[PDB]
């Protein structure tokens, strides 16, 4: 869909997982997709924990300066729904574990822009059918 729609969706998703008190009104379609994405990322994390012992914590301590490297590398050889869900799960992790929940700070905006630019630049909406 629309590039603006996805920019809107990403921000909405990040604000929701960040537990931002202030509700930034969005269409019902956007909320529905935010819901679907949160559920997916939790299923994804469930698989990650079954296969690996490590948390994302260690590698994401320098996220503000390496997150982009991680996203490029995540899609270096191919793009599929599963890696895209992992993409959002990395985002959910940062908002839930690293950053503080309940406030939308400059670091959040940094995360938001990083994810939004990479998503759109790499045509990820083309391989991410929320059906």
């Amino acid at each position: 869909k629309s590039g603006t729609y996805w920019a809107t969706l990403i921000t909405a998703f990040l604000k929701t997982v960040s537990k931002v008190e202030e509700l930034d009104c969005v269409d019902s379609a956007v909320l529905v997709d935010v819901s679907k994405i949160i559920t997916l990322t939790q299923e994804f994390r469930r698989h990650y924990d079954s296969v690996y012992r490590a948390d994302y914590g260690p590698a994401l301590k320098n996220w503000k300066r390496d997150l982009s490297k991680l996203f490029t590398s995540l899609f270096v050889d191919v793009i599929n729904s599963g890696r895209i869900v992992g993409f959002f799960d990395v985002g959910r992790y940062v908002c839930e574990e690293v950053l503080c929940p309940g406030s939308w700070t400059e670091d959040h905006e940094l995360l938001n822009d990083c994810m939004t630019h990479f998503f759109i630049e790499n045509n990820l909406m083309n391989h991410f059918p929320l059906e």
Partner: peptide
């Protein structure tokens, strides 16, 4: 390393579409 996490996420993403 961020590179290791990257391999683990790809492994999980690839196995996600399956399992």
């Amino acid at each position: 390393t961020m590179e290791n996490l990257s391999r683990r996420l790809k492994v999980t993403g690839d196995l996600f579409d399956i399992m």
